[PDB]
Amino acid sequence: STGSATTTPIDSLDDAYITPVQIGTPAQTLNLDFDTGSSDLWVFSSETTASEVDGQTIYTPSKSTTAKLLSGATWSISYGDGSSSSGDVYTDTVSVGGLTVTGQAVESAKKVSSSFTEDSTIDGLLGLAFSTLNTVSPTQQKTFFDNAKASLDSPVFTADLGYHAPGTYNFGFIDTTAYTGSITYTAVSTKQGFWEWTSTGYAVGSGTFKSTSIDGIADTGTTLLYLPATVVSAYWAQVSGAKSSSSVGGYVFPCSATLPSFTFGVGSARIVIPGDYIDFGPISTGSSSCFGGIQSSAGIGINIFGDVALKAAFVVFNGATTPTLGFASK
Numbered sequence: 638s639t640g641s642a643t644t645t646p647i648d649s650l651d652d653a654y655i656t657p658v659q660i661g662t663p664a665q666t667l668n669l670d671f672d673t674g675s676s677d678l679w680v681f682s683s684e685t686t687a688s689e690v691d692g693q694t695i696y697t698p699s700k701s702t703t704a705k706l707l708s709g710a711t712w713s714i715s716y717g718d719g720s721s722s723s724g725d726v727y728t729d730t731v732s733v734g735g736l737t738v739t740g741q742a743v744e745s746a747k748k749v750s751s752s753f754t755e756d757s758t759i760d761g762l763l764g765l766a767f768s769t770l771n772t773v774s775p776t777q778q779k780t781f782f783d784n785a786k787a788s789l790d791s792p793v794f795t796a797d798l799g800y801h802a803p804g805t806y807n808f809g810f811i812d813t814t815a816y817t818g819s820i821t822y823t824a825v826s827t828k829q830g831f832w833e834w835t836s837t838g839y840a841v842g843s844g845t846f847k848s849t850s851i852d853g854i855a856d857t858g859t860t861l862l863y864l865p866a867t868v869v870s871a872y873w874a875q876v877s878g879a880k881s882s883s884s885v886g887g888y889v890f891p892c893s894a895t896l897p898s899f900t901f902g903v904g905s906a907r908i909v910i911p912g913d914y915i916d917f918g919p920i921s922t923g924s925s926s927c928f929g930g931i932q933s934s935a936g937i938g939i940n941i942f943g944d945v946a947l948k949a950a951f952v953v954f955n956g957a958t959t960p961t962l963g964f965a966s967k
């Protein structure tokens with residue numbers, strides 16, 4: 638079997654992408670943030686504290702004839718930006734773009750952090766990292782991808798994120814019309830539970846390519862590109878008037894500037910991020926200072942190839958017994 642679903646930016650800056658997901662019988666459609674950096678499927682629900690819900694669509698297990706309380710199971714998660722949520726666990730039927738999994742753990746949020754509350758467009762997260770990171774206790778639960786793996790034609794899913802435009806998540810097949818050239822595959826380490834790989838180097842604009850190993854994770858759930866301080870300094874040095882701001886918390890640049898492209902290496906191949914992808918607009922309404930899409934990972938402890946990088950490519954998440962990551966130009 639296969640599945641295919643359209644993913645849509647939640648705002649004009651591509652801060653995140655939402656994908657419709659059908660949960661329960663009869664179907665309750667929620668717009669979830671597909672996150673290859675986490676491994677929990679959690680949703681706003683009828684159990685969420687009422688003051689913590691502001692316009693989200695909620696999952697109501699009592700209206701689903703296939704929902705089953707997973708007795709005694711709880712979950713609690715904290716993301717790298719300080720966000721947090723927790724609750725109990727149901728099992729139910731979950732369908733993504735025609736692909737159906739029965740008995741999927743659906744984690745019902747009783748408490749959500751303020752970050753999720755003030756984002757009315759995101760009804761929950763669908764984790765697509767490895768199941769070792771799932772937070773359900775005492776019995777760890779499998780991700781949607783892991784549960785679907787057996788019935789998929791191929792144990793892969795692909796991310797084709799658009800720049801200020803809709804994109805596609807495909808499950809079980811590789812759309813050979815969605816990219817140009819060849820797909821370059823590279824090895825994945827699962828030791829930390831992430832889609833972790835090693836980039837072979839970088840270049841700024843039309844400058845020389847610097848061969849150097851950059852270990853990082855492919856994370857559709859992170860907006861920006863977080864790279865070591867040496868790389869990020871070399872990039873912003875080429876932008877007149879750019880500077881690292883302590884009050885803003887990162888590199889800003891004059892909105893009048895034009896940004897150079899950024900190239901990262903995948904084996905012997907190169908993926909070019911257009912300079913326009915790195916512009917995240919004024920730091921405040923009316924400001925002439927703009928926020929940069931490439932920031933330092935020094936405060937995070939891990940390099941993150943977020944949406945800024947992934948939307949420049951067609952990305953294959955190959956969940957075979959030896960997992961690999963595929964990158965192609967598009």
Ligand SMILES: NCc1ccc(C(F)(F)F)cc1
Nearest residue numbers: 674675716717856858859939
């Ligand atoms: N997108 C999920 C996510 C968020 C943060 C991290 C961090 F901070 F631990 F690297 C990993 C994964």
